[PDB]
């Protein structure tokens, strides 16, 4: 049972990966605000960063926050088994990658534009705005799509 006494050096809301990560939330669930990182990826990155898991995202010093940024930037170079990522073996270069905050919807645009420019059925269904994963459309999913 640790009851820590600290001065006014608590770090309030902070910026990573062009995304607002706010303090007072545990570091794992604070990082999840960034697009492209979920609870599992946030937990794994936090644990590979050699930091405590009860630091409220406001006790993290700068240096251990650039360590966690670099771990997010290069997931493979920190002993991740590469089946854990978001984009494995892509069309362009076939290298296992993980997209981040501003790049997830960008790569989504690139893939959707590719499927449209190739006129594949999934791409044309996306262009029309229908369901692409094979759901029935007779009754369900009406008020918006």
């Amino acid at each position: 049972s640790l009851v820590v006494q600290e001065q006014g050096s608590f770090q309030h809301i902070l910026r990573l990966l062009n995304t607002n990560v706010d303090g007072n939330i545990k570091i794992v669930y604070a990082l999840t605000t960034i697009k492209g990182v979920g609870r599992r990826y946030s937990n794994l990155v936090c644990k590979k960063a050699d930091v405590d898991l009860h630091k409220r995202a406001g006790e993290l010093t700068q240096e251990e926050l650039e360590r966690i940024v670099q771990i997010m930037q290069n997931p493979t170079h920190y002993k991740i088994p590469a089946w854990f990522l978001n984009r494995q073996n892509d069309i362009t270069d076939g290298k296992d990658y993980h997209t981040l905050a501003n790049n997830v919807e960008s790569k989504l645009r690139d893939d959707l534009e590719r499927l449209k420019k190739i006129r594949a059925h999934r791409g044309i269904r996306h262009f029309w705005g229908l369901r692409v994963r094979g759901q029935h459309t007779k009754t369900t999913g009406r008020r918006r799509a």
């Binding site: 009851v3 006494q5 600290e6 006014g8 608590f10 007072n24 409220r56 406001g58």
Partner: protein
């Protein structure tokens, strides 16, 4: 029965599509409530001062009477039990019951 004309069926379908979502409820929301999960010096002094004379001690009453989150309530409550200024009555997860010492 009476079949509707194609124009009437189209009008009904277009009306249904244009229809807004009629939420059948009164939606009342309370205001933002914040609790200082980080324990600074002034809040710690308030803890060490007014937690004694509390007839009832628990995570919920620590949250209500002091703007601290449940996590800080639990860890500080166990800290006070370590210091022994509160004695237990029923020990159980998800529900703590504590009163004054001696």
């Amino acid at each position: 029965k009476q079949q509707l004309s194609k124009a009437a069926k189209a009008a009904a379908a277009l009306a249904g599509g244009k229809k807004s979502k009629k939420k059948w409820s009164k939606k009342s929301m309370k205001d933002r409530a914040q609790h200082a999960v980080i324990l600074d010096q002034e809040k710690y002094d308030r803890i060490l001062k007014e937690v004694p004379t509390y007839r009832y001690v628990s995570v919920s009453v620590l949250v209500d009477r002091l703007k601290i989150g449940g996590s800080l309530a639990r860890i500080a409550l166990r800290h006070l039990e370590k210091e022994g200024i509160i004695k237990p009555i029923s020990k159980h997860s998800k529900q703590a019951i504590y009163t004054r010492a001696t």
